[PDB]
Paper text:
Here we report crystal structures of the full cytoplasmic region of CpxA, a prototypical HK involved in Escherichia coli response to envelope stress. The sensor kinase CpxA senses a variety of envelope stresses, including misfolded proteins, and transduces this signal to the RR CpxR through conserved phosphotransfer reactions. The full cytoplasmic region of E. coli CpxA (CpxAHDC), encompassing the HAMP signaling domain (residues 188–237) and the DHp and CA domains of the catalytic core (residues 238–457), has been produced as recombinant protein for structural studies. The CpxAHDC structure consists of a homodimer, in which the HAMP and DHp domains from both subunits assemble into an elongated central coiled-coil region flanked on either side by the two CA domains.
The 3D structures of wild-type CpxAHDC (or the point mutant CpxAHDC_M228V) in complex with nucleotides have been determined in five distinct crystalline environments using either single-wavelength anomalous diffraction (SAD) or molecular replacement methods. In some crystal forms, however, only the C-terminal α2 helix from both monomers could be traced in the electron density maps, because CpxAHDC has a tendency to establish interactions via its central-core helices, leading to the formation of dimers-of-dimers that sterically interfere with the positioning of helix α1. The 3D structure of CpxAHDC is highly asymmetric, not only by a different orientation of the CA domains, but also as a consequence of two potential bending points in the central helix α2. When considering together all CpxAHDC crystal structures, it transpires that the DHp helical bending promotes a strikingly different dynamic behavior of the two CA domains in the homodimer, primarily due to distinct interactions with the central four-helix bundle. Thus, whereas one CA domain (from subunit A) is retained in a fixed—inactive—conformation close to the DHp helices (α2 from subunit B and α3 from subunit A) through a relatively large contact interface (∼1,200 Å2), the other CA domain with apparent unrestrained mobility adopts disparate orientations and displays significantly smaller CA–DHp surface contact areas, the largest of which (∼800 Å2) corresponds to the autophosphorylating Michaelis complex (see below). In all homodimers, the fixed CA domain is sequestered by the DHp domain in an inactive kinase conformation, with the ATP-γP positioned far away from the phosphorylatable His248.
Residue numbers in the entry:
A (entry chain B): 224 to 405, 418 to 456
B (entry chain A): 220 to 407, 417 to 456
The structure:
Amino acid sequence: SFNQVVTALERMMTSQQRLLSDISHELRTPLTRLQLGTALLRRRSGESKELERIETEAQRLDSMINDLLVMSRNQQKNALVSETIKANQLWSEVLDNAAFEAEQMGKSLTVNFPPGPWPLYGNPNALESALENIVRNALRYSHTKIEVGFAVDKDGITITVDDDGPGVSPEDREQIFRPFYRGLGLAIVETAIQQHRGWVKAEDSPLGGLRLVIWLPLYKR
Amino acid sequence: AAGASFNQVVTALERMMTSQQRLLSDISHELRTPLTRLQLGTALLRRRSGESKELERIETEAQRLDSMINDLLVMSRNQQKNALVSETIKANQLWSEVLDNAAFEAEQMGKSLTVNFPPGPWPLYGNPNALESALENIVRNALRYSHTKIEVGFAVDKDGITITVDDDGPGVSPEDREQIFRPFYRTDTGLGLAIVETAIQQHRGWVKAEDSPLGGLRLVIWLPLYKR
Ligand SMILES: Nc1ncnc2c1ncn2[C@@H]1O[C@H](COP(=O)(O)OP(=O)(O)O)[C@@H](O)[C@H]1O
């Protein structure tokens, strides 16, 4: 029955993925026809700003569908692949690359309260890229400075990212999380952190901009 | 700790599923952004250059996609809530309520549902919510398209249960029989048989559409029995 349960859980998941790859094939059915259509028009007639725009909007859609497949598969990679990991070990490189990128922009990143050997359970690549996006995003709004701080209590780690940028109005605070924001978006992070039983909140930064608060629970055996 | 390690994995996959629920509804919301840009692009090209077989085709493929995005946005809301648990279950317990609500809905429409061959205490292993909503959609369908009557029949052998749903409605042409199972497919949301086909194939069973002796469409669900 251990095998029976394993085989059952595999089929729950493979069927979810089948349904998704079948929706994407059905969305691509007219999309490929559209792309074949522009291709024939491009050869028959000339190239134009309009035809260029139609062709790039077609790619933009196919890319989104392609992200939907991958990001779905990755959420499975994330639930099945997980381990006990220390706060300082996990995000040290993240903060080091980020410190260098600020130095290049002429800006200054400061880790006032550094992470310690604090137990976390979960996908390391997921949590690595979670803070990485918040930190890349804080390098955008910020005029000159960014500040990262780590806190720990009996319940969990609290990561706080602050910028001296323009920030966000009280109304827009709750509505700062949706994808394809033009890192990628900020809803990837919300999903990623809620996947690890944590939460994310946006606030007024004492620096003048926006304060991003990531909370994750500590790992207890 | 033998089952404590299972709960933890189940809870993880539960959170994994609800995160894939969100991701889908968010992609679908974002898909109308480039589509409108594409439609304003063809519109300007129609104005600049002339009208052509190509431009006509691109414009109709854009509509076809828009429709799908709408269907995807509706079947983003009302997601398949609280699934993922497989268990041993008896056929009669499983679909009793399904057939009872369905018998009442027919009575309201002035139509008549008949369970000629009822389900028995037959062993099944799998997600109950998945199998309940599988037949539920097939009967939802058969209630809508039928003119006056619907017939449900259960059969069992050493290999498995065979559920047959028949309606006196218009039915489907020989060509569209397999096509009605595809996502967004409609003969004229189209995600009904898409979901049923997945739910059955998941339980290593099968679904087929045929000519009904009642005059409409015959839907055949075959599931295997659970052996201890
Ligand atoms: N009982 C039926 N009789 C005739 N046509 C049917 C029947 N059931 C389904 N169809 C056709 O197959 C299509 C696909 O079915 P389905 O996936 O369940 O979509 P929907 O959610 O609109 O019912 C329907 O839109 C309809 O054209």
